Amino acid sequence: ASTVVVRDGDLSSSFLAAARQCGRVTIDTETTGLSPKIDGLCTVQLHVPGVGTEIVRVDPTLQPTRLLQVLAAEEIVKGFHHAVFDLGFLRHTFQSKARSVVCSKVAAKILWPHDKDRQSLAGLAHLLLGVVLDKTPRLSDWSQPELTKTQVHYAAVDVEILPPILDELDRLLSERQLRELAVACWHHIPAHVELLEHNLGDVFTY
Amino acid sequence: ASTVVVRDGDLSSSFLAAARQCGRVTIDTETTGLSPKIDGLCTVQLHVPGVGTEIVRVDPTLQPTRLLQVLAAEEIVKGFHHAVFDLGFLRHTFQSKARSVVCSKVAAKILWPHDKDRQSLAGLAHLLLGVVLDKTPRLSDWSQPELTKTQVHYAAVDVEILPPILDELDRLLSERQLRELAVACWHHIPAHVELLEHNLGDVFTY
Numbered sequence: 001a002s003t004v005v006v007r008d009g010d011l012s013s014s015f016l017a018a019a020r021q022c023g024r025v026t027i028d029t030e031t032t033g034l035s036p037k038i039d040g041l042c043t044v045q046l047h048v049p050g051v052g053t054e055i056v057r058v059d060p061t062l063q064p065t066r067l068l069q070v071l072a073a074e075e076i077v078k079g080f081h082h083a084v085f086d087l088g089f090l091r092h093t094f095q096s097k098a099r100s101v102v103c104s105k106v107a108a109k110i111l112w113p114h115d116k117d118r119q120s121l122a123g124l125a126h127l128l129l130g131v132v133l134d135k136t137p138r139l140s141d142w143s144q145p146e147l148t149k150t151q152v153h154y155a156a157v158d159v160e161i162l163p164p165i166l167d168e169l170d171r172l173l174s175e176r177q178l179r180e181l182a183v184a185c186w187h188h189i190p191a192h193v194e195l196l197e198h199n200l201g202d203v204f205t206y
Numbered sequence: 207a208s209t210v211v212v213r214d215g216d217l218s219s220s221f222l223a224a225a226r227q228c229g230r231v232t233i234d235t236e237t238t239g240l241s242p243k244i245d246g247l248c249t250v251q252l253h254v255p256g257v258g259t260e261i262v263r264v265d266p267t268l269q270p271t272r273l274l275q276v277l278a279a280e281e282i283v284k285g286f287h288h289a290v291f292d293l294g295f296l297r298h299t300f301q302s303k304a305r306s307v308v309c310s311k312v313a314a315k316i317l318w319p320h321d322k323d324r325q326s327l328a329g330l331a332h333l334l335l336g337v338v339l340d341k342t343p344r345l346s347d348w349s350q351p352e353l354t355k356t357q358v359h360y361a362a363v364d365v366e367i368l369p370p371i372l373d374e375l376d377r378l379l380s381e382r383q384l385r386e387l388a389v390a391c392w393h394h395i396p397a398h399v400e401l402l403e404h405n406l407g408d409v410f411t412y
């Protein structure tokens with residue numbers, strides 16, 4: 001959490017430029033609960049490697065125009081942990097339909113299908129980076145008029161830790177010849193979000 | 207079942223040409239049971255609209271080279287009913303990895319998520335075409351040294367009925383603005399087959 005600014009309503013015009021120069025960003029959100037179609041989206045965090053992190057506080061009366069630009073941009077890769085969760089909120093709240101998203105949880109489920117510990121952000125961070133993540137601020141009040149120092153730091157860490165985690169999952173995927181499958185699965189995340197948004201369920205079974 | 211030929215081991219060179227001229231074919235299979243990774247693949251049926259239908263009897267000692275060419279060909283659309291099932295057999299038996307496949311079951315699950323009747327080939331044929339399909343030969347012995355007249359006719363009908371069914375689902379999908387979602391889902395079928403082949407399960411949940 002080297003350099004973090006809390007923004008109201010939208011990503012700043014400076015980070016939009018930095019995201020476009022970089023071609024790659026990481027994204028996370030804080031909410032009032034676990035149901036992307038019922039609970040409230042409170043903040044969206046965006047990190048530009050080398051530049052810093054913005055915490056965007058959602059306004060009900062404002063589309064976060066420049067944030068939706070980044071999400072939709074084919075030429076900007078957006079890394080998440082559990083992209084289906086975060087994009088479900090973004091889709092239900094803002095009608096956002098993202099392109100070029102990747103997900104460390106999907107990656108982890110391909111590499112370690114039977115191990116829930118390695119499928120969590122904290123499991124990935126400890127295994128790959130030697131880093132212990134503090135998870136206690138996740139249940140705090142993200143709609144509070146002023147985010148605390150602890151909140152800001154927590155919200156920043158969970159986007160700033162994704163670039164090294166994602167790079168390391170890429171290498172493990174390539175080694176086991178599963179990267180093309182992870183690539184195909186990441187490419188399906190936005191469609192999977194639409195299926196959930198429309199209550200269409202599992203279209204691939206009998 | 208206007209014009210049907212039973213082929214040993216592979217699709218004929220003439221249908222490979224006709225599939226390439228047409229740019230579109232429909233596909234179905236007959237098997238010894240419902241588990242694509244355990245049960246035997248007995249036949250693969252391929253229909254070229256306007257030309258006819260081949261029933262390919264699988265040989266254990268022979269890759270059906272020209273059939274695998276059609277399956278892999280990006281420029282040839284392959285229509286199935288329940289593509290995940292058929293491609294699971296083709297993937298486990300021949301290591302076949304298909305491109306540009308579409309599926310009437312996936313389409314039906316998007317249009318009618320809660321109605322199992324409309325998600326079956328016979329439900330689709332009756333609703334859309336007014337056609338009653340005889341399903342009794344499905345449990346017959348497809349590894350028998352000579353397929354019966356009833357078997358040949360059954361195996362041919364279930365590929366020849368797919369082109370009108372698929373064209374009609376396209377129109378219903380477009381009308382409700384769900385065709386882009388069906389297109390995205392069809393594009394994911396081969397990856398979903400790989401996930402099942404590797405026992406990776408649902409990579410898109412928590």
Ligand SMILES: [Cl-]
Nearest residue numbers: 006145146147
């Ligand atoms: Cl604040």
Ligand SMILES: [Cl-]
Nearest residue numbers: 212351352353
């Ligand atoms: Cl025969």
